[PDB]
Ligand binder design. Structure first.
Ligand code: HEM
Ligand SMILES: NCc1ccc(-c2cccnc2)o1
Length: 465
């Protein structure tokens, strides 16, 4: 046809705003999908976006035409501070350069090796101590979990972990939680459409920018310190490595290795490597309390395979199919980044029967793939069986795409999975979960859903076993 995917007729500037509920972007788009198809065009304010719903559409584009869909789209709130710099929100040469270096440097500091595994085990140990410190009292787990998670990636980029009593550390975690919630509210999704006006208007978006600026200032501060103490022969962390590469590229006019890309890339890892996993853990514990039978089987498998003495190690996952199914189901049900991070066609593209002009933005609806009724029998329920065969053995699914897929997929996936398995397992090994209310009354529906899926606030107690 040579034409863009079908979709509701947009109005000047506001686009399809009148046919969308900013507080429920996902449901609005899915409803529109019922009449236009799994592949349609939507106008988020002036942003023309091609929406991909369901496993087939998403995989066909991001994997089968991986290079064509390898461009990075926008996320207005984050672009406020990033401005196209850094590894995540960058495109072309800058993205290729920063991503290759980041993956390599991450591996140099233990990611994927025994080095980081030991780091996660030790930090898991610190979480256990902290949980024991609550004396079984009812608590908000939120920051107990984010502190532990953040310390893993923090060890890599800053060279050392934060003290759990570090007030400034708590401030930063609050900033990350704040930005994740904002981008998932009605105002945050409205911002994605009308940032051209809103970035200049009073409102919640301004407070959001301040949280981001607070994070950037902290990073800039850390970089400055490392600069005034850098050992070119012995890098201490991710920042040092980049600083070294920068020195080596000082004679290259068009190098991508300069201060701003260092600050933004480090900020990317600090935020991206913290809040995502933290959120998953938080939702996970809530779901396990909502389903005692699942916790029971988890404990059964842990006691048998690992016991009550030694610390869980990453290799234990191979001998624990149920736990593997449980973590997968948590990520599937959790649907933490419901619409992924926007992609964009790098050149004129022919997708299925449509035409996508170069630069077109793309919304891979990851949540629609994680609940694709063709891949999971009861997508709306939380059931580990979704990842298990009759034999109780772990069964993979092509529809398991919480980290997205393709050329700009999450390269933090390996670390994330090691953290999820080690933290979930070490916690369940040591504690029994006690909810504030009867299971049947626990609400596992999300508090907010926009850029991310945010679970409702809750308290709980960790009872030693
Ligand atoms: C449960 C945890 C996590 C989830 C659900 C998650 C999810 C995602 C998603 C959906 C994307 C976009 C993929 C795409 O464009 O196709 C992504 C990007 C990215 N993630 Fe994660 N992530 C997680 C953890 C991590 C961790 C631990 C790190 C940091 C070490 C990290 C770093 C990144 C980076 C740097 C990108 C941008 C990649 C690029 O543009 O080339 N993520 N993540
Ligand atoms: N790891 C995926 C993910 C979710 C949100 C973000 C993020 C947000 C702000 C800056 N850099 C990365 O990254």
């Amino acid at each position: 046809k040579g034409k863009l995917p079908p979709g509701p007729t947009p109005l000047p500037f506001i686009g399809n705003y009148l046919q969308l509920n900013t507080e429920q972007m996902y449901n609005s788009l899915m409803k529109i999908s019922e009449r236009y198809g799994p592949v349609f065009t939507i106008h988020l304010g002036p942003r023309r976006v091609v929406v991909l719903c369901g496993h087939d559409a998403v995989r066909e584009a991001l994997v089968d035409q991986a290079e064509e869909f390898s461009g990075r789209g926008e996320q207005a709130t984050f672009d406020w501070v990033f401005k196209g710099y850094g590894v995540v929100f960058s495109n072309g040469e800058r993205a290729k350069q920063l991503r290759r270096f980041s993956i390599a440097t991450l591996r140099d500091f233990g990611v994927g090796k025994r080095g980081i595994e030991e780091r996660i085990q030790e930090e898991a140990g610190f979480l256990i101590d902290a949980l024991r410190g609550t004396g079984g009292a009812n608590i908000d787990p939120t920051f107990f979990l984010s502190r532990t998670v953040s310390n893993v990636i923090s060890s890599i980029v800053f060279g050392d972990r934060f003290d759990y009593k570090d007030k400034e550390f708590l401030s930063l975690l609050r900033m990350m939680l704040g930005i994740f919630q904002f981008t998932s509210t009605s105002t945050g999704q409205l911002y994605e459409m009308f940032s051209s006006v809103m970035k200049h208007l009073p409102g919640p978006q301004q407070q959001a920018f301040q949280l981001l600026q607070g994070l950037e200032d902290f990073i800039a501060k850390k970089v400055e310190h490392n600069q005034r103490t850098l050992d070119p022969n012995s890098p201490r962390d991710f920042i040092d490595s980049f600083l070294i590469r920068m020195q080596e590229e000082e004679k290259n006019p068009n190098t991508e290795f300069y201060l701003k890309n260092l600050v933004m890339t480090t900020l990317n890892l600090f935020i991206g490597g913290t809040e995502t996993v933290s959120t998953t853990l938080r939702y996970g514990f809530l779901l396990l309390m909502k389903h005692p039978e699942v916790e029971a089987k988890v404990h059964e498998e842990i006691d048998r395979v690992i016991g009550k003495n030694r610390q869980p190690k990453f290799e234990d996952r191979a001998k624990m199919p149920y736990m593997e199914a449980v973590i997968h189901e948590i990520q599937r049900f959790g649907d933490v980044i419901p619409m992924s991070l926007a992609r964009r066609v790098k050149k004129d593209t022919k997708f299925r029967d449509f035409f996508l002009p170069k630069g077109t933005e793309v919304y891979p609806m990851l949540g629609s793939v994680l609940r694709d009724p063709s891949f999971f029998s009861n997508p709306q329920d939380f059931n580990p069986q979704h990842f298990l065969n009759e034999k109780g053995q772990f069964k993979k699914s092509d529809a398991f795409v919480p980290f997205s897929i393709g050329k700009r997929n999450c390269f933090g996936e390996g670390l994330a999975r090691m953290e999820l398995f080690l933290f979930f397992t070490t916690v369940m090994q040591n504690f029994r979960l006690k909810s504030s209310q009867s299971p049947k009354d626990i609400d596992v529906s999300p508090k907010h859903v926009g850029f991310a899926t945010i679970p409702r606030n809750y308290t709980m107690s960790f009872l030693p076993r």
